[PDB]
Every structure is written in structure tokens, then in C-alpha cells.
């Protein structure tokens, strides 16, 4: 089951390693350091989570078929109940924030229309598209001197 | 400084890159909720990044900056007793 599914996990490990450094820098507070460097080094390590989040969507047929938990062997007699909410995943408040995605879903919405309203959603996106080929088309429009020693070492040639 | 040219003309390329992927703000389930604040942060990040390269280059255009006389009283009072106490 998923001979190549583990090579996806080592790429979850490469992306998880983006958390490693990040969180050990959190504790590296409260003494202040290198906002530019860290911020860019935190942002850069975040992006890849989405790009391993991306390389997962090509494999999205196996998170749908889901490949799912045939997988639990160990018999961890109870104490894996914490590995059970852990194996469990499911949705956190982030779900409480998913319905905030549902009230941001706002209206809308179905029950709203069946089709021809939807075909006015797709015909609603596609016209945002053409405004962008009018965009790229107007874009290409404008597109003290060192201590004398080193100078005597420069009389030695030294730079 | 030929390196302010190489970085801040790669920052010019960055104003060029900053208008690129931002307006580029684009039109999966879990990851297409992802990419939608991914550019609110990384389009506007890089937007405060050329906003920061706006400031860096706004105020670093600035780093391109780099008597007892007592009037004539103690002047002409001792400008006489110098020369007329010189020859007389």
C-alpha cells in the first residue's frame, strides 16, 4: 500500500523540518533578533508546506480513496487513545473557523440556485480572467587609508 | 557602491518582481483555502518587501548626503595703535 506513499512522508518530514527551526526560534525569545533574516527564513520555510501541500494534490486520489487507516497495527493498549485523537486528526476549532468560512461563505447561496446561478459563478470567474490579458498587455508597456603597514605590505603587493 | 546597484537593481527587479506575483494574485480543497491567504501574506509580504525596499531606498537616498572682534571697536582701536604706535 503506497510503495511511493512513504516518499511522500519523507517530503512531509522535509516540510515538518520547517517547523523544527521555527519553533525553537520562538523559544529563542524574548531577546530580539534579525527580523528581516528570520521573517524571511520563517516565510520561506512556510511556503514549502503548501508546496508539499501542493505535491499532495497530485496524489489527491489517495487521500480520497484515502488509502486510509487499514494502517493501525500496534495494539497500544489504551494509551494510544491520545494517539487516537492523534491518529484521529479530524477538525479542530479550525473547524470552528471553517464555519467562519461558512458564514464568510455568507450569501449566496444554495440553497440558492441550481445551476444557472452556478453557471453565472463560472461565467463570473472567467470574466475576471480576460481582464488579466488586458493587464499583462499594458504591463509590458514600461517594462582613513589603511595603516601604512598594509601599504608597505602593499609595497609587498598585499591588497 | 556597485552592490547597491546589484541588490537594489535586483530590488528594481524586485519592484519588477513585486508587481509580478502580486497583481498575479490568482483567481484542491484544503490547499485552495491555503493559497488564498498565502498571497494575502506573501503578495503583501513581498509588498512590504518592496515597501521595505521602498524605505530602504527612500531614506538610503539620504545616505547619499555624506569671534572676539568687538566689531570694529577692538578692530580699528587696535588697528591704529598698531600702525600709528608703529610710526610716530
Amino acid at each position: 500500500p503506497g510503495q511511493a506513499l512513504d516518499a511522500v512522508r519523507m517530503r512531509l518530514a522535509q516540510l515538518t523540518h520547517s517547523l523544527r527551526r521555527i519553533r525553537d526560534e520562538m523559544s529563542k525569545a524574548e531577546l530580539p533578533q534579525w527580523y528581516t533574516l528570520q521573517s524571511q527564513l520563517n516565510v520561506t520555510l512556510s511556503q514549502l508546506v503548501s508546496v508539499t501541500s501542493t505535491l499532495q494534490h497530485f496524489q489527491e486520489t489517495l487521500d480520497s480513496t484515502v488509502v486510509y487507516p487499514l494502517p493501525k497495527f500496534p495494539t497500544t493498549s489504551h494509551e494510544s487513545l491520545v494517539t487516537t485523537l492523534l491518529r484521529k486528526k479530524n477538525i479542530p476549532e479550525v473547524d470552528e473557523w471553517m464555519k467562519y468560512v461558512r458564514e464568510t461563505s455568507g450569501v449566496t447561496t444554495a440553497l440558492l440556485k441550481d445551476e444557472e446561478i452556478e453557471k453565472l459563478l463560472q461565467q463570473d470567474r472567467e470574466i475576471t480572467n480576460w481582464a488579466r490579458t488586458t493587464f499583462r498587455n499594458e504591463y509590458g508597456k514600461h517594462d582613513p587609508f589603511n595603516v601604512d603597514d598594509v601599504l608597505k605590505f602593499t609595497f609587498t603587493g598585499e591588497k | 557602491q556597485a552592490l547597491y546597484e546589484k541588490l537594489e537593481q535586483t530590488r528594481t527587479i524586485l519592484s519588477v518582481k513585486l508587481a509580478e506575483l502580486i497583481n498575479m494574485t490568482t483567481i484542491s480543497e484544503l490547499a485552495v483555502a491555503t493559497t488564498s491567504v498565502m498571497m494575502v501574506n506573501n503578495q503583501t509580504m513581498q509588498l512590504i518587501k518592496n515597501v521595505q525596499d521602498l524605505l530602504i531606498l527612500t531614506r538610503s537616498i539620504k545616505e547619499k548626503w555624506l569671534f572676539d572682534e568687538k566689531q570694529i571697536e577692538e578692530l580699528l582701536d587696535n588697528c591704529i595703535e598698531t600702525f600709528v604706535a608703529e610710526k610716530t
Binding site: 517547523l19 521555527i22 520563517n42 512556510s46 508546506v49 501541500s53 499532495q56 489527491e60 489517495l62 487521500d63 480520497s64 484515502v66 488509502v67 486510509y68 487507516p69 491518529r87 486528526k89 479530524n90 477538525i91 479542530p92 479550525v94 473547524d95 473557523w97 | 484544503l30 490547499a31 483555502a33 491555503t34 491567504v37 501574506n41
Partner: peptide, 25 residues
């Protein structure tokens, strides 16, 4: 369903999303 273990690690993104956003202030 190997997807739902990754929707709570989508939720690992939000606490970094709002902690990165509350950093922005």
C-alpha cells in the same frame, strides 16, 4: 482520509497564520 489527518495539519497552518498575523501587528 489520509486527507483528514492533513486537514488538522491545515489547522497547524492557521495557528501559524494568526500567530504570524498577530506578529504583523
Amino acid at each position: 482520509i489520509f486527507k483528514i489527518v492533513q486537514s488538522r495539519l491545515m489547522s497547524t497552518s492557521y495557528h501559524l497564520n494568526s500567530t504570524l498575523e498577530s506578529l504583523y501587528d
